[PDB]
Design an enzyme around this catalytic site. Structure first.
Site, PDB file in Angstrom:
ATOM      1  N   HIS A  41       0.635  -1.270   0.003  1.00  0.00           N
ATOM      2  CA  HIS A  41       0.113   0.057   0.179  1.00  0.00           C
ATOM      3  C   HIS A  41       0.873   1.364   0.183  1.00  0.00           C
ATOM      4  CE1 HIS A  41       0.217   0.543   4.534  1.00  0.00           C
ATOM      5  NE2 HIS A  41       0.282   1.589   4.291  1.00  0.00           N
ATOM      6  N   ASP A  90      -0.642  -7.098   1.574  1.00  0.00           N
ATOM      7  CA  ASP A  90       0.151  -6.191   1.712  1.00  0.00           C
ATOM      8  C   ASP A  90       1.374  -6.205   1.989  1.00  0.00           C
ATOM      9  OD1 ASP A  90       0.254  -3.146   1.773  1.00  0.00           O
ATOM     10  OD2 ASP A  90      -0.641  -2.919   3.890  1.00  0.00           O
ATOM     11  N   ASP A 186       0.714   1.457  19.768  1.00  0.00           N
ATOM     12  CA  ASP A 186       0.540   0.579  18.699  1.00  0.00           C
ATOM     13  C   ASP A 186       1.393   1.366  17.436  1.00  0.00           C
ATOM     14  OD1 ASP A 186      -0.995  -0.427  16.515  1.00  0.00           O
ATOM     15  OD2 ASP A 186      -2.829   0.567  16.759  1.00  0.00           O
ATOM     16  N   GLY A 190       2.429   6.181   9.163  1.00  0.00           N
ATOM     17  CA  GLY A 190       3.851   6.313   8.907  1.00  0.00           C
ATOM     18  C   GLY A 190       4.631   5.132   9.130  1.00  0.00           C
ATOM     19  N   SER A 192       4.188   2.179   8.341  1.00  0.00           N
ATOM     20  CA  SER A 192       3.678   1.066   7.246  1.00  0.00           C
ATOM     21  C   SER A 192       4.936   0.599   6.489  1.00  0.00           C
ATOM     22  CB  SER A 192       2.623   1.760   6.322  1.00  0.00           C
ATOM     23  OG  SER A 192       1.468   1.824   6.645  1.00  0.00           O
ATOM     24  N   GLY A 193       5.001  -0.559   6.343  1.00  0.00           N
ATOM     25  CA  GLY A 193       6.108  -1.437   5.656  1.00  0.00           C
ATOM     26  C   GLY A 193       7.241  -1.621   6.473  1.00  0.00           C
TER      27      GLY A 193
END
Ligand SMILES: *[C@@H]1O[C@H](CO)[C@@H](O)[C@H](O)[C@H]1O
Ligand SMILES: *[C@@H]1O[C@@H](C)[C@@H](O)[C@@H](O)[C@@H]1O
Ligand SMILES: NC(=[NH2+])c1ccc(N)cc1
Ligand SMILES: [Ca+2]
Ligand SMILES: [Ca+2]
Ligand SMILES: [Ca+2]
Ligand SMILES: [Ca+2]
Ligand SMILES: [Ca+2]
Ligand SMILES: [Ca+2]
Ligand SMILES: [Cl-]
Ligand SMILES: [Cl-]
Ligand SMILES: [Cl-]
Ligand SMILES: [Mg+2]
Ligand SMILES: [Mg+2]
Ligand SMILES: [Mg+2]
Ligand code: NA
Ligand SMILES: [Zn+2]
Ligand SMILES: [Zn+2]
Lengths: 254, 191, 142
Positions: A41, A90, A186, A190, A192-193
């Site tokens: 994504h 993803d 959590d 930002g 992500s990945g």
């Protein structure tokens, strides 16, 4: 990362900072000198495919030091089954134009064998997630690399402990939940990945990729991670493939 | 597969067995046990039994709170169907075993009644620990005789009448407990 | 049980219940009080559940009411000490004791393997790096 701590310089050696046109895009995980695993994504809005840079050895985005290594991203491989705008499958495998040099500050995380990951790593309670993402849901992002310890849940437990939300994505076999439902810790957008890394008998392995969640540290919700064990064969096969002219490649999966 | 149900903890003097339903039909089970922050340990791999001895796991720390889950696997060999068990804190929930009156001696004008050391499944430095070794001050023994006596040790020193032969029975008790406070009464022993 | 000439004597727990097996009423006649007779009878008529020697592999049995407890020798477990800890070296059991990778071999012993950048040690279970910077290790600490 909400509620985590700064990852001491050099202690998250496999963390990658992905940039597009020189601006912060997403996190990633170095798995060897040439390949980086990130989230599919992260490339949903990319137009300048020749402007992707992977930075290794990064820590403080506000300062440059002699430990940072930047490489051009030559290829971004995504499962053809992934649909932009959605959550399933993803994952992205990026080929760097030239290899990074392994140093005390740049080290790859071990991509594990599938069975070892499913029967052993999947039962290690805690794992670390990191990145330079939001410090608060919808807040400012971090200048220093952040890291957080999160507990993993089997999907049945995740569903049973997650607050009912209309339109919520299905948590498939290609994902897993990890975190706290109490609004305190959590990973976030930002991040992500970035890696969800599991320590086992003295070695660290890649088990998940920061993928999605309902907000960040939202009560009644956990972070959802790409289940890397489902892609071991896909990743290994592809890493042995030869480069193609274009940057983006949608490869068949399985 | 069908998920296990009615998962129950059967525990006495720390011998702890998880039991469940139903009998397997073309499926096998595997049990996992952990503490809230610990890793999941697997036990009773691909068993056709509907019970699993978890004694060796819980005796590592009897005061910890454990949770277990029973995985159902189809016959022949992706997250399996499973059911979580109730939480179980051995120190607070293990039943006290039935005691045994070891002896009784008329010392002077009194009778000393000695309760046999109740051995448990916790095995410190090679040997099995007694209930008192484990509970210490949390454990007392009570005596019903013919009327009631209580001790912080395993011995009672009671006053008796000359040549009257009394009958005794004892119970293991953890007074601080609200539930499952006592063992079953020991067999009756008379002079 | 009864046999006339032995029944001339007064009641005796030892004679009738300890040396001979007595009925609830014989016992009741001895204790008189219901409760007394009840707690005696509860264990007296319970039976020794260890009689059938349920504990295997050198375990020890300890009787309880309508049940027993098996104390096992260190290499065994299970309600009846029926599980041999030595026959449990499989990959699902704590990775088969392997540091990194584990491979099951039915009929034979499991083997341990290592990730690239590591080689298997003498012990057959530990892994050692064969490169300066193996994956999954944090050099600035170690
Ligand atoms: C006699 O032993 C058997 C097993 O060996 C057990 O099932 C019984 O309960 C015990 O009395
Ligand atoms: C019963 O307990 C086991 C552990 C061994 O000590 C046996 O010899 C004993 O009879
Ligand atoms: N863990 C999360 N809440 C999360 C992760 C990624 C993302 N894009 C949005 C939220
Ligand atoms: Ca920097
Ligand atoms: Ca007779
Ligand atoms: Ca008789
Ligand atoms: Ca009589
Ligand atoms: Ca009679
Ligand atoms: Ca009995
Ligand atoms: Cl480059
Ligand atoms: Cl979000
Ligand atoms: Cl005791
Ligand atoms: Mg006699
Ligand atoms: Mg009689
Ligand atoms: Mg009568
Ligand atoms: Na939350
Ligand atoms: Zn650095
Ligand atoms: Zn730089």
């Amino acid at each position: 990362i909400v509620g985590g701590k700064v990852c001491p310089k050099g202690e998250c050696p496999w963390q990658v900072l992905l940039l597009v046109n020189g601006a912060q895009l997403c996190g990633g995980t170095l798995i060897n000198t040439i390949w980086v695993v990130s989230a599919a994504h992260c490339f949903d809005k990319i137009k300048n495919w020749r402007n992707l840079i992977a930075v290794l050895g990064e820590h403080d985005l506000s300062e440059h030091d002699g430990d940072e290594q930047s490489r051009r991203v030559a290829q971004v491989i995504i499962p053809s089954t992934y649909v932009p705008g959605t959550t399933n499958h993803d994952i992205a495998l990026l080929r760097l134009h030239q290899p990074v040099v392994l140093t005390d500050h740049v080290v790859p995380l071990c991509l594990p064998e599938r069975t070892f990951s499913e029967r052993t790593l999947a039962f290690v309670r805690f794992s670390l997630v990191s990145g330079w993402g939001q410090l608060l849901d919808r807040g400012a992002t971090a200048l220093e690399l952040m890291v957080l310890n999160v507990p993993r849940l089997m999907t049945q437990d995740c569903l049973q402990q997650s607050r009912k939300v209309g339109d919520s994505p299905n948590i498939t076999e290609y994902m897993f939940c990890a975190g706290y439902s109490d609004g305190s810790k959590d990973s976030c957008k930002g991040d992500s990945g970035g890696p969800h890394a599991t320590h086992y008998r003295g070695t660290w392995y890649l088990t998940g990729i920061v993928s999605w969640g309902q907000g960040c540290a939202t009560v009644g919700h956990f972070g959802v991670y790409t289940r890397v064990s489902q892609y071991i064969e896909w990743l290994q096969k592809l890493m042995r493939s030869e480069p193609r002219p274009g940057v983006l490649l949608r490869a068949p999966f399985p | 597969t069908v998920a296990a149900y009615n998962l129950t903890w059967k525990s006495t003097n720390f011998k702890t067995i998880l039991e469940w339903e139903p009998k397997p039909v073309n499926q096998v089970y595997t049990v996992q046990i952990s503490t809230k922050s610990g890793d999941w340990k697997s036990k009773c791999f691909y068993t056709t039994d509907t019970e699993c001895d978890l004694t060796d796991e819980i005796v590592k720390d009897v005061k910890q709170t454990y949770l277990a889950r029973v995985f159902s696997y189809p016959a022949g060999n992706g997250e399996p169907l499973y059911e979580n068990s109730p939480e179980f804190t051995p120190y607070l929930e293990t039943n006290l075993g039935q005691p045994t009156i070891q002896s009784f001696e008329q010392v002077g004008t009194k009778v000393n009644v000695t309760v046999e050391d109740e051995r448990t499944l916790v095995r410190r430095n090679n040997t099995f620990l007694s209930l008192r070794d484990v509970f210490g001050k949390d454990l007392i023994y009570t005596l019903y005789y013919w009327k009631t006596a209580k001790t912080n040790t395993n011995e009672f020193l009671i006053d008796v009448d000359k040549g009257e032969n009394y009958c005794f029975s004892v119970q293991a008790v953890i007074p601080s407990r609200t539930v499952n406070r006592k063992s079953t009464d020991s067999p009756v022993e008379c002079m | 049980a009864n046999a006339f000439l032995e029944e001339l004597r007064p009641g005796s727990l030892e004679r009738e219940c300890k040396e001979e097996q007595c009925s609830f009423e014989e016992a009741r006649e001895i204790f008189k009080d219901a409760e007394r007779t009840k707690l005696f009878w509860i264990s007296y008529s319970d039976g020794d559940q260890c009689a059938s020697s349920p504990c295997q592999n050198g375990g020890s049995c300890k009787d309880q009411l309508q049940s027993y407890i098996c104390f096992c020798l260190p290499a065994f477990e299970g309600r009846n000490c029926e599980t041999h800890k030595d026959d449990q070296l499989i990959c699902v059991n704590e990775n088969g004791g392997c540091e990194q990778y584990c491979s099951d071999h039915t009929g034979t012993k499991r083997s341990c393997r290592c990730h690239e950048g590591y080689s298997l040690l003498a012990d057959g279970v530990s892994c050692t790096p064969t490169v300066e910077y193996p994956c999954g290790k944090i050099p600035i600490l170690e």
